[PDB]
Amino acid sequence: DRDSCVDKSRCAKYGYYQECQDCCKNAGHNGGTCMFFKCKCA
């Protein structure tokens, strides 16, 4: 119970990264955003 895509799935400089939004959505949400190589949810 400690997945956290933020510290698992990489990302680009910033914006929309299909990789990030995919992770979150797969976790049990809708998606997320990209923040300085960081993967956050929405």
Side-chain angles (χ1 to χ4, degrees):
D1 273 47
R2 287 176 228 174
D3 235 279
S4 218
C5 295
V6 191
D7 205 79
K8 220 62 103 86
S9 187
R10 223 195 164 72
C11 207
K13 204 177 181 140
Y14 37 55
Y16 196 113
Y17 192 36
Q18 213 170 320
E19 223 116 302
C20 195
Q21 65 124 121
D22 264 77
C23 213
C24 195
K25 172 225 124 262
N26 229 304
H29 307 303
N30 312 96
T33 184
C34 201
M35 256 256 261
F36 176 73
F37 314 144
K38 307 200 63 161
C39 179
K40 210 148 204 274
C41 274

